[PDB]
């Protein structure tokens, strides 16, 4: 996204800016749930060979 975050945590961001960050936040956390499944299954494949 073209418009960035100028302020910082200490001074406090605004309405607009905070909403931005949820995208990255949520994306990251959602990633955890569904991605560790892939890794896990992978691991089990490898283990079953070796």
């Amino acid at each position: 996204i073209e418009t960035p975050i100028t302020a910082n945590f200490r001074e406090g961001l605004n309405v607009l800016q905070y909403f931005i960050s949820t995208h990255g936040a949520r994306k990251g956390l959602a990633d955890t749930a569904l991605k560790t499944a892939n890794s896990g299954y992978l691991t089990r494949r490898l283990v079953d060979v070796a």
């Binding site: 945590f9 406090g12 949520r26 959602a30 283990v47």
Partner: protein, 1341 residues
């Protein structure tokens, strides 16, 4: 300028902007929807009304008898709220409906002159909603969650890449009904149009229109644009419109009017096109080549013989042109397919489409649905029509219709349920459009494309289902029997109605146990919104798109309240001010901006409407209730953000907090907390537990008052006036004469609920807030729920926390806590657990409840009553017996050894088993109350009688004093009217009471109101005598339980659970921790002043976790206590009231751009000193979410507290007395203890109950189970060389019975030897292989 409760606790608002309109009563959604279900409104087609008219009026087969619907009535509930809770009943009202049987005559034309029968029939009990917005489901509190789904109508979807190596563009419009099967239209790779019908498979779209009786000719007419091709002499001339040449390579010399126009080869550019457009062209001079390649429109029959020279949709060719001109059909009508704009789509379609007419179209329809079923005419027709055009089967609802009509850009808002045929054609038009590039694609996740289901619409649908089944039955029995003598009441069944209801309420996954950990959990949980459920999204069906953050969630759903893990993205909280429109779309309120000036006018917009207009954020600065601060201002529009000038400003946010959900709104310095932890914070709040003591949160958002109020666990004043009686059980209030109804007496009653069991084992305790004889107004907080202080949400308590390392006790977010926490009993949790005892009867004989048990000491005997019952108030621990039960044993076949031994000690012991209910080990506490449910059949126990006698006494006393206090208030009110026109105080009072109804005075309007309260008095009598007689019978009535069950005992245990090491706690900012050690007071570091700290957090937990708000809370928190301590000292020092006056006012008004302009000086001395003592314990300040206190205003307060500006002080280590080489951050922070109790989470097993088939230990602490050793864990042992541990886990610890038993006793014989066996799971396995018919056998060596 504030009410009495606020006068008592004013929190200092730092909020720099004014919330204009009020925070709407949050739990309104539920009530409004449910209330719509029952809404008596003839025209408004919803709920009852909607379903009724859809089916009714119900006409019989023969056309002579009919059933008509008049109207419905809701009775008064058979069972009250509390009572249903007690007996495990569902809370419900009777529904009774007026129905009329009318019979026409066969012979007389339609003479309704024969027979007219009518009555009100009972159609079952309908579950009612509480005052809270909850529901009573077999004795437990449940909530129905709102449901998001993809709204009925049209979805225009594009597969960008999506599928293919090629990377081809695939367009699909989806047809989503309320009720019925589904329709998909998509583009084949070579651009040919296919349908998925009920997503079964893919076949040609064209066939459908054949079924609708369109010939190929009508098809291509309506779709493609015909072109008139005149043949005169030997010259071929088209009627050409200029903008069809649009970028057309010239294939000929194009002679129009005069001279050469287009080069033989050179392309038609726009200037050429506009020139010939200007010329006004009718007929050009095409050669021989153009028509060869195109196609003919209609079916051109040969006039001469009568036979078809050309059919519809044949490729154009040389000889055919000669023959058609020879027939004298000199007006041919060719088609237009020059790619680009109007392409060869439907044309190519028709060629691959093998089907011909109406007939073969319906054949293929029928065939795909049930392949192999023979083509009967009736079956195919009926199938087709029933699929999309049947009214009771296929209903779009108002919703489907609106969104559908807005997808194709129509005008009518409402429609009929069934799909009109024109609609279908027009959408396929829009698909073909998008394929060419006239319009573009609608997004799946748009908030206008997603709709929400409340209560009423859910109810609606499930009610309709009961109706459907009942319809089969109804129409069936209407034709067999005799029409005259049989009545409507004998016709009507109830079973399937009540079945449908209990399925919805009971079985549904959207209906769940209320989260009652805290008021916050409840209130939040009630407004949570799920994407799952019937007609909604699945786990695997869910990719990234839907779960991630859609821009439209702005001000509608709070973006930051969702469970972590797999359900993330699925479940979300409604944002604060957001509400649903009529259609079930979310709307958000905005302020109108008229030409630069910010009005006061509030407009709610849907997502759809939102997409249009240009709106400024709440943070933009406001010029003196007129215009804007800045000439270039900051806003958003059409889903993107940036700069605009004043004049372009259309609308604006009311307040910042409108973007946030409720839970998140409570966290103060949200502005400085990363969302990762923010999210976690909200969830944490939901898992918090009420301690006994409520300490007001010093660092709040102001929102704590609204949260409390709305949760509805408090008592609020209906009328206001003066408090007559205060009890820790009853609050009785005398109303303002202003507000008082001339109907009933002015006496409002609040019986408080004290100390009952919540679902999570939590305690439910109400405390009265006001004192006796005190003044209150409408909407004053009268009694608090558990986690609530005077008006405010009090999730927990605030403590002195210091950031710093301790001797590795605070390592990775571990928590060091003081003994002082225990000493002061803060965070001591209240638990109320329910234990049960169940007495049945078997073939083995009657189980019963007795004090008599084999081989127990008088220790247990002494704590039991006559019947085997615990005494009230008993203190009991693990292993203790609560309720005695005996069960008949079978034959005792003892080993020979046991036979002899019996003989030897000579205690034969009767054929009985000890079944008694015992306290589970680890838990221990206080039996507070016991309830018993006797059977109807079997005679009552003495314990039974005495407790039901108690119920009598209690019932009596309660209702007696109800009548007595109500009576006194009513008589005192009559005294106010007789004292007007009739001064007499000495001989009225001293004379009797009810001889004030022989009272015959002035006959004006004085005598009329006496009778008003006099007839009300007669009803006080007839109501009470009933209200008594009803509640006597229910107490005494035999309690009806499950078949086989004689009697039940419910035992309510109180757990006084103190905070300990291993317990879980956190703050608002996500940061959390386990208690690692309780340090004695001595060990904790302390101030120069001598006060030591309460809790120590490790600093290292903050930086990388990114949540700085907790720090600001700490600093502000010490400052608040600095204010409190200033106040405390001046309070203790008495001094002068005016002096206190000065300090306190200047405190409020300190904040630089403080909005909340605190009016003090006028305050009466009383109000002053009282408030003083409240803020004695620290001042309550308000930083609103984002609209919060800057670093500047905060440091300013620190100066006023006479503290360090950085909030750091030099501290001494309580162990050594050595000072810390750096001054450290301290301050007061608001803390919470979570539902997670190491108490319950402790478990360990040696040997116990095993699994039936596999013979392994069972699961969980629940069964005293062994923990499961998974693949990964096994793998651990594998990596080491460790064979024996492995084999242990494999055999002696699991499925080998001989092995485990043998090894246990060898261990007890000091052997520790292994001696391995054979896994019983393995044998299990073997035999299952044999059973599936495969021979597998163990080879001998």
């Amino acid at each position: 300028v504030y009410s009495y409760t606020e006068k008592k606790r004013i929190r200092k608002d730092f909020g720099k902007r004014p919330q204009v309109l009020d925070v709407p009563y949050l739990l309104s959604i539920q009530l409004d929807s449910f209330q719509k279900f029952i809404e008596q409104d003839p025209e408004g087609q919803y709920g009852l009304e909607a379903a009724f008219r859809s089916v009714f009026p119900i006409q019989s087969y023969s056309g002579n008898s009919e059933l008509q619907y008049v109207s419905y009535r809701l009775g008064e509930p058979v069972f009250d709220v509390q009572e249903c809770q007690i007996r495990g009943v569902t809370y419900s009202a009777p529904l009774r409906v007026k129905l009329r049987l009318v019979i026409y005559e066969r012979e007389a034309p339609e003479g309704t002159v024969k027979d007219i029968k009518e009555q009100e029939v009972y159609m079952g009990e309908i579950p009612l909603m509480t005052d809270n917005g909850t529901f009573v489901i077999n004795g437990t509190e449940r909530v129905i969650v709102s449901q998001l789904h993809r709204s009925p109508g049209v979805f225009f979807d594009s597969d960008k890449g999506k599928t293919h190596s090629s990377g081809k563009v695939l367009y699909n419009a989806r047809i989503i009904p309320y009720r019925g099967s589904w329709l998909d239209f998509e583009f084949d790779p070579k651009d040919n149009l296919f349908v998925r019908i009920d997503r079964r498979r893919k076949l040609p779209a064209t066939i459908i229109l054949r079924a609708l009786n369109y010939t190929t000719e009508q098809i291509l007419d309506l779709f493609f644009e015909k072109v008139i091709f005149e043949i005169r002499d030997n010259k071929l001339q088209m009627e050409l419109v200029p903008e069809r040449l649009r970028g057309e390579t010239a294939s000929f010399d194009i002679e129009a009017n005069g001279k050469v126009y287009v080069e033989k080869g050179r392309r038609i550019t726009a200037r050429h096109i506009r020139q010939l457009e200007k010329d006004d062209v009718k007929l050009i001079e095409v050669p021989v080549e153009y028509i060869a390649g195109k196609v003919v429109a209609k079916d051109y029959i040969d006039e001469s013989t009568g036979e078809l020279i050309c059919a519809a949709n044949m490729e154009l060719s040389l000889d055919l042109l000669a023959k058609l001109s020879q027939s004298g059909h000199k007006r041919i009508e060719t088609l237009f397919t020059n790619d680009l704009d109007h392409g060869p789509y439907i044309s190519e379609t028709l060629r691959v489409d093998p089907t011909n007419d109406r007939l073969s179209a319906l054949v293929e329809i029928y065939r795909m649905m049930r392949p192999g079923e023979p083509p009967t005419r009736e079956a195919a027709e009926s199938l087709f029509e029933n699929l999309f055009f049947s009214e009771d089967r296929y209903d779009l609802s108002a919703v489907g219709r609106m969104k559908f009509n807005r997808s194709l850009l129509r005008e009518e808002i409402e429609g009929s349920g069934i799909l009109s045929k024109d609609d279908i054609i027009d959408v396929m038009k829009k698909l073909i459009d998008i394929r060419n590039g006239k319009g573009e694609v609608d997004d799946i996740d748009h908030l206008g494309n997603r709709r929400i289901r409340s209560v009423g619409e859910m109810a609606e649908n499930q009610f309709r289902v009961g109706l459907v089944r009942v319809e089969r039955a109804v129409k069936e029995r209407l034709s067999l029997g005799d029409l005259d003598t049989l009545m409507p009441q004998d016709m009507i069944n109830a079973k399937p109605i009540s079945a449908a209801v209990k399925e919805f309420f009971g079985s549904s996954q959207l209906s769940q146990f209320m989260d009652q950990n805290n008021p916050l959990s409840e209130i939040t949980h009630k407004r949570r919104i799920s994407a799952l459920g019937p007609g909604g999204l699945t786990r695997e069906r869910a990719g990234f798109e839907v779960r991630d953050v859609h821009p439209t969630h702005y001000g509608r759903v709070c973006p930051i309240e969702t469970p972590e893990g797999p359900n993330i993205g699925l479940i979300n909280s409604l944002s604060v001010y957001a509400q649903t429109n009529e259609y079930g779309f979310l709307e958000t309120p905005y302020r109108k901006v008229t030409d630069g000036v910010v009005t006061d006018e509030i407009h709610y917009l849907s997502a759809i409407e939102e997409g249009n207009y240009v709106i400024a954020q709440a943070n933009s600065n406001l010029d003196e209730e007129g215009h804007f601060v800045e000439d270039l201002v900051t806003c958003r529009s059409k889903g993107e953000s940036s700069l605009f000038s004043r004049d372009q400003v259309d609308y604006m946010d009311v307040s910042t907090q409108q973007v946030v959900s409720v839970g998140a709104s409570l966290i103060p310095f949200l502005e400085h907390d990363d969302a990762n932890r923010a999210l976690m914070g909200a969830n944490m709040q939901r898992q918090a537990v009420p301690t006994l003591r409520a300490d007001k949160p010093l660092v709040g958002t102001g929102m704590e008052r609204a949260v409390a109020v709305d949760s509805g666990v408090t008592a609020v004043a209906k009328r206001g006036g003066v408090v007559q009686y205060v009890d820790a059980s009853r609050i009785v209030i005398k109303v303002n004469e202003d507000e008082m109804y001339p109907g009933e007496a002015g006496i409002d009653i609040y019986n408080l609920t004290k100390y009952t069991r919540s679902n999570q084992n939590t305690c439910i305790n109400q405390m009265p807030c006001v004192s006796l004889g005190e003044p209150v107004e409408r909407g004053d907080v009268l009694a608090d729920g558990p986690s609530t202080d005077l008006g405010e949400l009090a999730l927990g308590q605030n403590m002195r926390v210091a950031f710093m390392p301790w001797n590795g006790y605070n390592f990775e977010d571990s928590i060091l806590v003081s003994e002082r926490v225990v000493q002061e009993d803060r965070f001591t949790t209240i638990h109320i657990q329910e234990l049960a005892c169940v007495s049945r009867d078997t073939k083995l004989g009657p189980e019963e409840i007795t004090a008599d048990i084999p081989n127990v000491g008088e220790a247990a005997l002494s704590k039991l009553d006559e019947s085997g019952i615990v005494y009230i108030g008993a203190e009991v621990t693990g292993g203790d017996i609560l309720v005695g039960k005996v069960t008949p044993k079978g034959e005792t076949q003892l080993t020979p050894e046991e036979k002899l031994l019996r003989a030897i000690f000579g205690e034969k012991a009767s054929d009985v088993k000890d079944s008694s209910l015992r306290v589970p080990n680890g838990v221990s506490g206080t039996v507070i109350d016991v309830q018993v449910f006797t059977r109807d059949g079997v005679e009552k126990d003495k314990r039974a009688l005495e407790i039901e006698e108690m119920q009598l006494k209690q019932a009596k006393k309660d209702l007696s004093e109800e009548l007595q206090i109500l009576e006194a208030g009513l008589f005192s009110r009559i005294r106010a009217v007789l004292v007007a026109g009739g001064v007499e105080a000495e001989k009225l009072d001293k004379l009797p009471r009810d001889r004030w109804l022989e009272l015959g005075l002035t006959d004006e309007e004085k005598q009329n109101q006496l009778e008003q309260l006099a007839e009300q008095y007669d009803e006080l009598k007839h109501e009470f005598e009933k209200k008594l007689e009803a509640k006597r019978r229910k107490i005494t009535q035999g309690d009806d339980l499950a078949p086989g069950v004689l009697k039940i005992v419910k035992v309510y245990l109180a757990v006084k659970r103190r905070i300990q090491p291993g317990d879980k706690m956190a703050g608002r900012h996500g940061n959390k921790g386990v208690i690692s050690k309780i340090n004695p007071i001595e060990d904790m570091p302390y101030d120069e002043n001598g006060t030591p700290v309460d809790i120590v957090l490790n600093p290292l937990g903050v930086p990388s976790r990114m949540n700085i708000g907790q720090i600001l809370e700490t600093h502000l928190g010490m400052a608040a206590k600095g204010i409190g301590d200033k106040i405390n000292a001046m309070l203790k020092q008495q001094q002068e009231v005016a002096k206190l006056r000065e300090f306190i006012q200047r405190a409020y008004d300190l904040g630089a751009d403080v909005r909340q302009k605190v009016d003090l000086s006028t305050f009466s001395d009383e109000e002053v000193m009282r408030l003083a003592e409240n803020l004695r314990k620290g001042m309550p300040i308000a930083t609103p979410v984002f609209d919060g206190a800057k670093e500047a205003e905060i440091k300013e307060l620190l100066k006023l507290g006479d503290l360090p500006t950085s909030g750091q002080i030099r501290l001494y280590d309580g162990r050594t007395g050595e000072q810390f080489e750096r001054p450290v951050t301290v301050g007061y922070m608001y803390m919470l203890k979570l539902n997670h109790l190491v108490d319950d989470k402790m478990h360990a097993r040696s040997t116990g109950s095993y699994s039936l088939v596999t013979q392994q230990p069972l699961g969980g602490k629940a069964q005293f189970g062994g923990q499961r050793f998974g693949e990964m864990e096994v793998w651990a042992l594998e990596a080491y060389g460790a064979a024996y541990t492995l084999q242990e886990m494999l055999t002696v610890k699991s499925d080998d019975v001989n092995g485990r038993t043998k090894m246990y006793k060898n261990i007890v014989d000091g052997n520790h030897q292994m001696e391995p066996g054979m896994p019983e799971s393995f044998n299990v396995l073997l035999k299952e292989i044999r059973s599936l018919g495969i021979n597998i056998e163990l080879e001998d060596e």
